[PDB]
Design a protein around this ligand. Structure first.
Ligand SMILES: CN(CCOc1ccc(C[C@H](Nc2ccccc2C(=O)c2ccccc2)C(=O)O)cc1)c1ccccn1
Lengths: 9, 258
């Protein structure tokens, strides 16, 4: 999931 | 309670400035010419010539340019979302759902800040693409931008400020109505507090607009309709021009959306 990576940044 | 809601309004505005490089305050100053000019794009010649200023067939070049801007807008909104108090402490799966349904509604909300009735600013203000040029594109490309201009003209008449928009976009993503939400009660607790700060902010910043809060909430459903029409227009691109393909970030947004 690309969105999860932007939230976990 | 009053001094706490105004601290939340000041908290969202400062996080707003740090998340979006082109604010409404700067954008309206460029559009009115009250500053110290963007390259006007009105046809294929000015587009093929102004491509050195665009941060990135004629219709395909506008398609690719929007996709590039859209990817960047999602990342800036996600950064703003992580600064909303309580949002980052929510479960990670709901954070995705909240951003999956709220990004485009915020994109179209902030797309109005850069719009007038003639065109829209592009490339952080360095360019200006006219509505007449975006409407003369080959179909279905020519009907993508007109619904956004019609909404922006009505939305800008509210004369909201960047401090007002910061709370409003926060209210948008903190909506407990999104499908797939696991824990709705903490999300609604954050939105109800966001709505109180929004209501208080509109009474302080706009003592003349008596029912601005009510009028603002009524545009909040117009954004969901634009998203629907935009989705059903993107599916035509997937079917008509079998050459185009969406960015992996935008593909995950629309994957199983509504
Ligand atoms: C118009 N303008 C300002 C940005 O306007 C936006 C208008 C809409 C969007 C949302 C975004 N849109 C697209 C995403 C991928 C491909 C095309 C689109 C279009 O929306 C589109 C389709 C056909 C023809 C023209 C556009 C989304 O759905 O995620 C993001 C930005 C441009 C245009 C070219 C380059 C840069 N700035």
């Amino acid at each position: 999931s690309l969105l999860k990576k932007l939230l976990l940044a | 309670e009053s001094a706490d809601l105004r601290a939340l309004a000041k908290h969202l505005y400062d996080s707003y400035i740090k998340s979006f490089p082109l604010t409404k305050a700067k954008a309206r100053a460029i559009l009115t010419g009250k500053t110290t000019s963007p390259f006007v794009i009105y046809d294929m010649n000015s587009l093929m010539m102004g491509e050195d200023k665009i941060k990135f067939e004629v219709a395909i070049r506008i398609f690719q340019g929007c996709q590039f801007r859209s990817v960047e807008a999602v990342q800036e909104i996600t950064e703003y979302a992580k600064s909303i108090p309580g949002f980052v402490n929510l479960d990670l799966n709901d954070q995705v759902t909240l951003l999956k349904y709220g990004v485009h509604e915020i994109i179209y909300t902030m797309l109005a800040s850069l719009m007038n009735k003639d065109g829209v600013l592009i490339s952080e203000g360095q360019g200006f693409m006219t509505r007449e040029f975006l409407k003369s594109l080959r179909k279905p490309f020519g009907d993508f931008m007109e619904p956004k201009f019609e909404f922006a003209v009505k939305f800008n008449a509210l004369e909201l400020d960047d401090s007002d928009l910061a709370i409003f976009i926060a209210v948008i993503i903190l909506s407990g109505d999104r499908p797939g939400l696991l824990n709705v009660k903490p999300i609604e607790d954050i939105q109800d507090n966001l709505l109180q700060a929004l209501e208080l902010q509109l009474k302080l910043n706009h003592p003349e607009s008596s029912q601005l809060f009510a009028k603002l909430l009524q545009k909040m459903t117009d954004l969901r309709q634009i998203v629907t029409e935009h989705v059903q227009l993107l599916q035509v691109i997937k079917k008509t021009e079998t050459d185009m393909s969406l960015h992996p970030l935008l593909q995950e947004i629309y994957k199983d959306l509504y």
